[PDB]
Design a protein around this ligand. Structure first.
Ligand code: NI
Ligand SMILES: [Zn+2]
Ligand SMILES: [Zn+2]
Length: 161
């Protein structure tokens, strides 16, 4: 068959519609890893963009960043931090989170491969990789990924609540 996101509200149901797009503050509109569907707008986001890196840590009611300013109070935004960020900062922060999770699947990072992996321009990928280097999550030079430091210190610094 074909692989793409969809929803089973009960175990004997299947719903898919091209109207339920990916719409996430990272600006990437493709499925990639763990995806989560917003309770309010029924559109899809990358869990990692909302600092969710384990399907057991994901909320049962996900409220995306667009919806955070319009749902009643009892529906908490999944990542309140994002609501405080300026738009260009917001996109850069979610992309950084995607980059951190993506780097954990690579032994070495090469700029064209990395740009394609994340769907970004080369100059953006250079910016990300130079940041990974300063943090110590990859080496200076491709660039060997320091997987242990990334998964331990890096996830603590950027994802742990
Ligand atoms: Ni399914
Ligand atoms: Zn995203
Ligand atoms: Zn929403």
């Amino acid at each position: 068959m074909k692989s793409s996101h969809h929803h089973h509200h009960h175990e004997n149901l299947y719903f898919q519609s091209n109207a339920n797009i990916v719409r996430c503050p990272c600006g990437c509109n493709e499925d990639d890893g763990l995806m989560i569907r917003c309770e309010e707008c029924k559109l899809w986001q990358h869990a990692v963009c909302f600092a969710i890196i384990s399907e057991d840590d994901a909320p049962e009611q996900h409220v995306c960043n667009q919806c955070a300013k319009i749902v009643p109070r009892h529906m908490k935004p999944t990542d309140p931090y994002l609501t405080t960020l300026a738009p260009v900062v917001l996109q850069a922060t979610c992309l950084w989170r995607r980059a951190l999770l993506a780097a954990t699947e690579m032994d070495r990072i090469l700029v064209p491969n990395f740009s394609r992996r994340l769907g970004v321009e080369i100059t953006v990928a250079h910016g990300l990789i130079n940041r990974l280097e300063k943090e110590g999550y990859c080496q200076n030079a491709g660039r060997l990924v320091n997987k242990e430091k990334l998964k331990s210190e890096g996830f603590k610094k950027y994802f742990e609540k």
